[PDB]
Amino acid sequence: MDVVSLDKPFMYFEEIDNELDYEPLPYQGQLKLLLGELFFLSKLQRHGILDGATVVYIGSAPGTHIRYLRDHFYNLGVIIKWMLIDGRHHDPILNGLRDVTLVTRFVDEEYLRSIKKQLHPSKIILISDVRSEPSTADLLSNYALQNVMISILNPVASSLKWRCPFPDQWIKDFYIPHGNKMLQPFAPSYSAEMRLLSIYMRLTRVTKSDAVNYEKKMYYLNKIVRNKVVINFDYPNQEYDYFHMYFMLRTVYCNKTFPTTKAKILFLQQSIFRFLNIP
Ligand SMILES: Nc1ncnc2c1c(I)cn2[C@@H]1O[C@H](CSCC[C@H](N)C(=O)O)[C@@H](O)[C@H]1O
């Protein structure tokens, strides 16, 4: 790989500072979700709004990584209830947890109102990973449903699956919430997916020119940036994705104390990799 010297990685989409013309690990998907959700929920913990909340995770199955998320905050003493809702069955590793409610159901507008009624007036934190390759109509239907989740559940914060439809497959302008577009390390090599993180809802219009901007910015990120070795980085692995993961994991809280920040991140990465069975 090519070498580079960086003070920090790109954390949000807006920070990508170049574009490029697009051209055609074990269980890496669970690692991608676990890191982004650790990042999101740790930010909410820093703002002091996580304690006492109920996390409503829609599109959670199988959700093997969710067991690590729940165990992490449970051992920190943070009082969290989990509600995992998906039409498919969840990973059996999520069984036998009193603070984790497993729901086998595809959500619609009617069911969203019923769960809001039963959880009201407790704080709701929404995590959505719903999907269906998907067509642009599928994405528009998925993103419409995510808007319905927010307008009905009225969460204090939300993390939404966000991949803009490709410009050559455009159908119609649509609206998404305002928020920060978190970038995902260990995503597929040329994925353009991000997580929309919002702390509360004003809607924002997405156009075909935005789709072009997304496509070129994310290709430059995947083709150029993520194939760099950060030579100044003090870490056993200097590849950019590990550099990126390192900066996400340093916002994570820990019960154990460490002599250095590097020792803390190294412990966290080892803990995550072992649970996900990554060498
Ligand atoms: N309306 C809905 N209500 C409920 N779940 C819905 C929908 C719709 I539309 C789609 N999904 C679900 O989203 C998942 C996408 S991959 C998750 C991956 C998961 N986050 C993991 O950790 O492995 C599938 O499991 C699918 O069943």
Author numbering: 1 to 24, 34 to 141, 147 to 214, 219 to 297
Excerpt from the paper describing this PDB structure:
It is caused by the monkeypox virus (MPXV), a double-stranded DNA virus from the Poxviridae family, that replicates in the cytoplasm and must encode for its own RNA processing machinery including the capping machinery. Here, we present crystal structures of its 2′-O-RNA methyltransferase (MTase) VP39 in complex with the pan-MTase inhibitor sinefungin and a series of inhibitors that were discovered based on it. The structure revealed a mixed α/β fold that resembles the Rossmann fold. The catalytic tetrad (Lys41, Asp138, Lys175, Glu218 for MPXV) is absolutely conserved among these unrelated viruses including the conformation of these residues.
We identified several compounds that inhibited the VP39 MTase significantly better than sinefungin. Among them, three (TO1111, TO1116, TO1119) had a relatively small substituent (small aliphatic chain or iodine atom) and five (TO427, TO494, TO500, TO504, TO507) had a large aromatic or heterocyclic substituent. In each case the electron density for the inhibitor was well visible allowing us to unambiguously model the inhibitor although the electron density for the large 7-deaza substituents was less defined than that for the SAH scaffold of the molecule. In the case of TO1119 that bears the large iodine atom at the 7-deaza position of the nucleobase only the water molecules near the iodine bound to the 7-deaza position were rearranged. TO1119 that only slightly disrupts the water network has IC50 = 128 nM while all the inhibitors with bulky substituents had a lower IC50 except for the only substituent that is able to form a hydrogen bond, the TO500 that possesses a benzimidazole heterocycle.
